[PDB]
Amino acid sequence: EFVPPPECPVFEPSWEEFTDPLSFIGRIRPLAEKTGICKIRPPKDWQPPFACEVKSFRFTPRVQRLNELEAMTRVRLDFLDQLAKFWELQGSTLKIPVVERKILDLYALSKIVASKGGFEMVTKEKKWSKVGSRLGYLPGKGTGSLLKSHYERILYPYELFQSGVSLMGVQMYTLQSFGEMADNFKSDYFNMPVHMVPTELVEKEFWRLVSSIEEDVIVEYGADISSKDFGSGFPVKDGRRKILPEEEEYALSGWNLNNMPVLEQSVLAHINVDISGMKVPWLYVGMCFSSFCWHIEDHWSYSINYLHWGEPKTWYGVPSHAAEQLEEVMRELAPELFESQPDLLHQLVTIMNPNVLMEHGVPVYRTNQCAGEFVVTFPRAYHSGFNQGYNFAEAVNFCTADWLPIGRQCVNHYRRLRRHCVFSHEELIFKMAADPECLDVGLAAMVCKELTLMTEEETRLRESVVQMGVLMSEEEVFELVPDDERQCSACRTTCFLSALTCSCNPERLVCLYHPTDLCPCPMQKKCLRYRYPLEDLPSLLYGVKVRAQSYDTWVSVMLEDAEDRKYPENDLFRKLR
Ligand SMILES: CC(C)c1cc(C(=O)N2CC[C@H](n3cc(Br)cn3)C2)[nH]n1
Ligand code: NI
Ligand SMILES: [Zn+2]
Numbered sequence: 001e002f003v004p005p006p007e008c009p010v011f012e013p014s015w016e017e018f019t020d021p022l023s024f025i026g027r028i029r030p031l032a033e034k035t036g037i038c039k040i041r042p043p044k045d046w047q048p049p050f051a052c053e054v055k056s057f058r059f060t061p062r063v064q065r066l067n068e069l070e071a072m073t074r075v076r077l078d079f080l081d082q083l084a085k086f087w088e089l090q091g092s093t094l095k096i097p098v099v100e101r102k103i104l105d106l107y108a109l110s111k112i113v114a115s116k117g118g119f120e121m122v123t124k125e126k127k128w129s130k131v132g133s134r135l136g137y138l139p140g141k142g143t144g145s146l147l148k149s150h151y152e153r154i155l156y157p158y159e160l161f162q163s164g165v166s167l168m169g170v171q172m173y174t175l176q177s178f179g180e181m182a183d184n185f186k187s188d189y190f191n192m193p194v195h196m197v198p199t200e201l202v203e204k205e206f207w208r209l210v211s212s213i214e215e216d217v218i219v220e221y222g223a224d225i226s227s228k229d230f231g232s233g234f235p236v237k238d239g240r241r242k243i244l245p246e247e248e249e250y251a252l253s254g255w256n257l258n259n260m261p262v263l264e265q266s267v268l269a270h271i272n273v274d275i276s277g278m279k280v281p282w283l284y285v286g287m288c289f290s291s292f293c294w295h296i297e298d299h300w301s302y303s304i305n306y307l308h309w310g311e312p313k314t315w316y317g318v319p320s321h322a323a324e325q326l327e328e329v330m331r332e333l334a335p336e337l338f339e340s341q342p343d344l345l346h347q348l349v350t351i352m353n354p355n356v357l358m359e360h361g362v363p364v365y366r367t368n369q370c371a372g373e374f375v376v377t378f379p380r381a382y383h384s385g386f387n388q389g390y391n392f393a394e395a396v397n398f399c400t401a402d403w404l405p406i407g408r409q410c411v412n413h414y415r416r417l418r419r420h421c422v423f424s425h426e427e428l429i430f431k432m433a434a435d436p437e438c439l440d441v442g443l444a445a446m447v448c449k450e451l452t453l454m455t456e457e458e459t460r461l462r463e464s465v466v467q468m469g470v471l472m473s474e475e476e477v478f479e480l481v482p483d484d485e486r487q488c489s490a491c492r493t494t495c496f497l498s499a500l501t502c503s504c505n506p507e508r509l510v511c512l513y514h515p516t517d518l519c520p521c522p523m524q525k526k527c528l529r530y531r532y533p534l535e536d537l538p539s540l541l542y543g544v545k546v547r548a549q550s551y552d553t554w555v556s557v558m559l560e561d562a563e564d565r566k567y568p569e570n571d572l573f574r575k576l577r
């Protein structure tokens with residue numbers, strides 16, 4: 001019944017193309033960009049050895065019930081819809097909390113609390129830990145009594161309202177053993193050897209199972225697994241190990257996902273300035289039917305995903321230019337609700353059958369990722385998928401010159417939601433501007449383009465605030481204050497260039513796009529806490545415009561200055577030799 005979408009392009013580079021990954025990825029960009037995702041087959045000789053011992057690799061499995069795997073079911077949405085309207089009536093604007101790294105499933109929570117007699121029943125029986133169990137929350141971190149606090153604050157009043165009339169007060173595992181599991185499950189399921197069931201058939205059954213209430217099917221996986229803690233699946237030189245000479249090659253390869261963030265063309269390659277969460281790969285142990293939902297990368301960045309070993313991983317991809325279109329159809333499922341909670345759209349995990357997106361006009365492509373192949377994801381390319389079988393994968397994010405203006409647009413969009421920021425885009429650009437040499441020429445060029453656009457937009461914001469009637473101008477070093485303190489009262493964007501403070505609160509901030517929402521205290525007194533006194537315009541645009549317009553002229557001892565300034569060498573250095 002399920003209709004496979006068209007396949008995304010594969011790329012089989014030569015050994016020479018394969019030597020500089022990010023340059024090879026900029027070559028295929030104009031083409032792969034249009035499918036959102038794409039597959040990459042390294043030379044068949046290229047076979048890095050798996051660094052990890054499977055027999056002693058202990059991970060805690062998470063679990064998936066493909067029936068309740070879709071969160072945007074009619075019932076859950078209408079519940080949140082009504083619950084929001086309830087809190088509007090009371091004049092208090094539903095605020096959905098976060099528990100153990102992800103949003104609280106209130107619908108599930110009220111269903112369960114109600115199924116065992118309601119809030120006070122569950123309290124006077126102390127079954128709040130059982131609740132958090134059935135909600136999948138990992139014990140015994142105390143979540144039981146954390147839910148009670150939330151239920152009471154948010155759901156008990158609705159429980160009463162929804163209840164009778166009832167309102168008067170108050171208010172305001174081993175990798176080894178895991179393979180045994182997986183292979184046994186798959187064979188018992190299809191009554192075949194695992195390596196013998198065809199891909200197309202698993203694909204058909206998966207999407208069946210998502211919408212089937214007629215039967216329940218549970219599955220286990222592993223994720224939220226840092227290389228930092230568990231170790232990378234690649235060899236790397238960090239003192240943990242003598243690296244064998246058989247491996248030396250692969251420890252240095254730019255396709256080793258531990259080296260990608262640091263390559264000369266990566267944005268983070270020199271900013272030893274902030275833990276961005278992704279300079280460090282993540283591991284994904286997979287099982288038949290294990291799945292990941294539709295998502296885009298934080299700050300709309302690239303993802304690259306290597307399947308170390310195992311059975312294939314199925315993907316689905318959507319080009320960036322269809323991203324606004326993709327979100328639009330998901331929003332159709334509860335427009336009123338997503339009005340009040342714009343970012344709730346992304347917080348809510350979904351596997352929308354690709355067919356559905358296609359019959360709504362959304363381009364969708366697909367591929368089977370096989371052991372030893374890469375998958376690349378392009379900025380704002382939604383993607384999802386499921387595993388054909390037991391396998392093991394490793395992934396990073398990364399950012400390139402061509403991403404810088406997308407990153408800037410992404411903050412503008414996070415700002416127009418109420419979405420936190422993993423880092424300050426503007427800070428990133430200055431940290432790059434503050435080391436113009438040894439900075440890939442492309443970036444430099446792009447930085448200038450991007451930095452001038454910000455000097456403008458800032459000075460506009462800087463001049464607009466003096467009319468409003470602020471006088472004093474303190475000067476602060478934002479990068480040295482923790483993110484959570486330099487965020488905006490209501491944006492909530494990490495401020496770096498400039499923000500507004502007043503004396504009502506010792507430290508409660510607002511970005512310059514929202515200067516009214518700081519505090520009723522009139523603008524009469526200060527304060528525009530800034531970072532540079534508009535004496536940056538000459539300085540920093542210079543160092544970059546230097547290395548930007550030094551390469552412009554150099555092309556128009558010459559082969560020496562390119563070696564000193566660390567220039568690139570594809571067609572231009574070729575003509576040298
Ligand atoms: C960690 C950061 C860099 C990341 C991961 C992904 C990603 O999309 N995938 C999908 C396939 C694989 N996978 C995840 C689960 Br859960 C199961 N398989 C990794 N994108 N960025
Ligand atoms: Ni991803
Ligand atoms: Zn004040």
Ligand SMILES: [Zn+2]
Nearest residue numbers: 488491511514
């Ligand atoms: Zn703001």
